[PDB]
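Record format v2
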Amino acid sequence: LRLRNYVPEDEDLKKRRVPQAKPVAVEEKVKEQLEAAKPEPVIEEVDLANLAPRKPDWDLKRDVAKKLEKLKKRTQRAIAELIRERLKGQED
Amino acid sequence: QGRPREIINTYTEAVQTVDPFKATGKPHTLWVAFAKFYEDNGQLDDARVILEKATKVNFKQVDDLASVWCQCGELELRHENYDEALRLLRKATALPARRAEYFDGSEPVQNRVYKSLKVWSMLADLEESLGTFQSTKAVYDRILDLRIATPQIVINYAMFLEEHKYFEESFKAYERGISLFKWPNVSDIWSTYLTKFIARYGGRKLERARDLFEQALDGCPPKYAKTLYLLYAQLEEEWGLARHAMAVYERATRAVEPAQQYDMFNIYIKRAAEIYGVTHTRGIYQKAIEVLSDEHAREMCLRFADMECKLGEIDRARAIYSFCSQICDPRTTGAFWQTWKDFEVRHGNEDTIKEMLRIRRSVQAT
Amino acid sequence: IYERFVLVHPDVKNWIKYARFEEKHAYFAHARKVYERAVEFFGDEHMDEHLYVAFAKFEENQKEFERVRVIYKYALDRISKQDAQELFKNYTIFEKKFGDRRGIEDIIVSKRRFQYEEEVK
């Protein structure tokens, strides 16, 4: 038998209780950006990736990548079909 | 001790003499020891009769009678008479014909027990161990309708619904418990809810979580809001537009505690600093110099100007230093003038070093 | 006295106060009539979202989810979507309490569709 909500007054019954899922300190992960939160001239060296903007389409390409993965499988199939058909013809 | 008849009599005398309303030491503690003595003697039916008499008592507080009802259940658990334990708690939970308050002292103490957190939580543990899923869930439904539930009990219920793999109901349970409660409490309820959702169903149907994030942000106190802004913008970085993440970061600069806002301005600058950085942070630095206090403004002014130096915008850079010079007392802030001098030596010229000194000496006069 | 008061001061705030008073004491047969008379009286002259949010909560307590959805649709077809956000917010929470995931998303999508259409315009 398994118990999870009450806090039994018998300690012998307390032993039966299921160990409850502890949380994770989300603030600890937040600290990485809080270390990024140091006020600094973030061109700390003349790093052209900061100086020249990226393509904002990389975030768009990231969303298109998932579709491109689906497309890549179909493209690989279609390319293979042409290669199979042509190699068969070129077997002779 | 060692003289059972004397022990039995003095319990009876204690029960007769002690007024619960004047009891120094809570009266149920007598009843527990009274029942325990018979239980130690194996006289379980007499102990039950003691517990029955105990339930008839209208004690000073509901917690006294509630603790008795627990001991009624706990006795049967030790002797594995689990059906009787359920039966007792069914009678304990059993509603008055009125929709009675937990607090109305004119009502009998027995009536008030129906709301009690301890009794319902115990009965819930009984049903989950012994009985069917739907009957167990019906306890939680009553608890929610009666507004008894703590967020921990919701989290227990949520995990229970995940073990029975009806996660849609589990999300409904989180949503109901958010709707009942108020800040700060709601913060941790959101965190557990979002964690569960993002794993299985955040992959599947992303957009509902954005709206759910938006609902979570509503009225949120700044420390918890700060966490939620970063988490939402991360999700925006993981699956949405980067441009929306920047907007959420802009909210973080606005809402949060002012000293932490200065930190949040640096996050807003630094995540920009790759892609947006040269274009966007020039806007953010100007805004920050207007908003923030003199110490943080001077730090912002220098690093904005130094960024323009590395850009080569020497005319704009010296304009920022000129505006900064209004705040930089040439006596104490010598580090500012020297780092400006290091700019005038390396980038500028000897007459531009003098130009800084024309600014320095005239400001020092003022 | 409430009946007399509401006749002297016919304001939406007073009707809600009277209706909630009966509701608290569980005289639901009386409370409903107060809501029914209110939507009759105001409905042909003025339509405040405040009454319908309250009356939805009544039928929610009654568990008449079908009646609740009728109330919200009747309000949504006539009140502009830009004022109906608090209307939508309670409705979307309502569907989050008792509606299926499919039904929840469609009402949310239609709201988002309106929002994105505003972006497009």
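Chains C and A do not touch (no CB pair under 8 Å).
Residues 101-120 of chain C form the longest helix (20 residues).
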